[model samples]
Structures are given as structure tokens and as C-alpha cells.
Target: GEYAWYYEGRNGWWQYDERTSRELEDAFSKGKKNTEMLIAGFLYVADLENMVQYRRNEHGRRRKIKRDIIDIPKKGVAGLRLD
Candidate 1:
């Protein structure tokens, strides 16, 4: 399944590969603020079946995934803003 990052504050979404998503989770668990924003932005996991609905609202495009899907990783390396 594909992973995505949603920013509640900006109402934005970012899609990421499974590997990178896991890495972001790791950084979040370690209390990295840079990664924390990406982690805390979203609320829950939703199937891409409804992804199209969200996309219509100007949120983002959808990536096909299996049954379950959810929203990310990385640090203050650069250019990872939800804006």
C-alpha cells in the first residue's frame, strides 16, 4: 500500500513511498519536530476508495493502494513544507 502525509493546519497532503513513510515514523517517535509536523498533521487512515472524494475538494490526487491506507518521515534536510 502507498503512504501519504496530511497537514491539518494547511489542509494539504503529501504522498510518499512505504520505505520513506516508515523512516518518517521513526523520526517522529524520536521526537524530531521536523518530522513531528508531518506525523501530527493527519488524523487517521482511509482507503483510497474515498481518495477521489478528497481530491475533488482540492486536497490532493489519489494513489491506488490495497485495502488499508494512511498518512510520513524525514528531517530538517530541506523543502518538505506542506505549503
Candidate 2:
């Protein structure tokens, strides 16, 4: 339920019920590759969250963490160096 759901019929998600028991008697369908991709990403993040931190610097503060994040699709794309 945490992860978002997407389908061809809806832009983002769908409601559970309707006012009437309507049925779409039509031959229609769409590839669920998008949903599969979304679920895969969610699973990947959850697994990563459970892993213990491996970057330990008992030796000194020289072992710094840094990165240039970019392509954060929903927000924006930038190469900002982080420390």
C-alpha cells in the first residue's frame, strides 16, 4: 500500500469502488510493465533499507562521503556535490 500504483486507465491510481456495479464489457488491455517496474523499485529500496551500514571510519575522519546527485525526476535534475 505504501508504493504508488499506476495503470493505463488511470493517470496515477484507482478507487476501490463505484456507485453502481458497472461492468466494462469490452475487449481491452494494456501492458503492466510500468507497474512491474514501480514494484521492482519499491522492493529494491526496502531491501536496501534493511541492510546494515558498511561505511565505517574508525581510523579517521578522512573517509568522507560525497556524491553528485542528479536526475531526481519528480523534483528536478541537478549535479549538486554533497558532503
Candidate 3:
């Protein structure tokens, strides 16, 4: 079965005869304005992060888990820690 996809909005329009090609086209061809690609890109990065520690020994896994770091900043830092 041949699947096709199409789209358009004031700026432009596009069409693809193959579903696979259409999906990739929709994801990459449309640029930042493509919300589907934007969300997919974000989720893809998040998925890649999950693979950073994929399969390993306990020590290696422990280190990988410890490496999951996030930073927080204070709005004022208490008088700038005395600026």
C-alpha cells in the first residue's frame, strides 16, 4: 500500500508519496516551526541520555547513576553571599 502525506500553512506546503519519507520530511524539512519535530527532537535527546548508562557492571552503573547531575541557582544568593 502506498501511503502519502500532505501539509500546508500560509508560508508553504509539502507532499510525500511514501509514509516513511513523509515522516522524515515532516520531522526535518520543516525547521523549527515544526512542533512534531521539536518535541521528537527533545524526546530523542532524552532517550539518548537514557542510553548513556545502558548495560554495564554494578560499579560502572553506580558511577553512571552518580553522574546524573542537575544544577540549581538561587535568585538572589542571599545578598550575593555578601556582594
Candidate 4:
């Protein structure tokens, strides 16, 4: 099945199985709020075939970047600067 995954600060990666693109958006929304879980960095969705990164731009909205992963430092979400 396809999945969306994100890095959490202490617990490591968390994966959510999603059925559609709308569900992927829901997953991203849930992941962004650090209320329950610590979102260490960006969110990513992956099928058995492909993957992409969801990054927030300077406008405070997310835009998709085509990649399996992004190379950012371990300094957590603060290291995720707008490109």
C-alpha cells in the first residue's frame, strides 16, 4: 500500500497508510501540528513506485518537491529553510 511518512523528534519516522490524495493532505495537516507528536521536519508521501517531499514555502503554505528525501541537518524543523 502507499504511505505518507514524516520525521518526529524523539520517536523517529511515522507512517500512515492513505487511500487517496485527499487522505495524504489530511496526513500532512496532522503531521504539521506538534501538539501530540513532534514534527522534526518535512512530510513525504510514497507509493511502491514513487516519492515526493511536502515543504512549506515562505508564504506559509506547502508546495511539493519531487524527491524521496531532503538533505537537512539534524537541528530539527528549524533547519528546513525555504528554497
Cα-based lDDT for every prediction: 0.36, 0.17, 0.25, 0.33
- Which one wins on TM-score? 1
Off by over 4 Å in 2: 1-11, 16-21, 25-83
The TM-score that candidate 1 achieves is 0.28
lDDT for predicted candidate 3 compared with the true structure: 0.25
**1-83 in candidate 4: lDDT tens per residue?**
33333333333332322233335445455654321212244343322123333333322323222212434333233234233
Q: Judging by lDDT, tell me the better candidate of 1 and 2.
A: 1
Estimated TM-score for each candidate? 0.28, 0.12, 0.18, 0.19
**Model 1 spans > 4 angstroms off:** 1-12, 35-83
Error of 3 at 78 (Å): 60
Model 3, residue pairs in steric clash: none
Residue pairs clashing, model 4: none
**Candidate that scores best on lDDT:** 1
Candidates in descending lDDT order: 1, 4, 3, 2
Better of 2 and 3 by TM-score: 3
Q: Candidate 1: lDDT over CA atoms?
A: 0.36
Enumerate clash totals for all models, in the order shown: 1, 0, 0, 0
Which of the predicted structures, 1 or 4, would earn the higher TM-score when compared with the native? 1
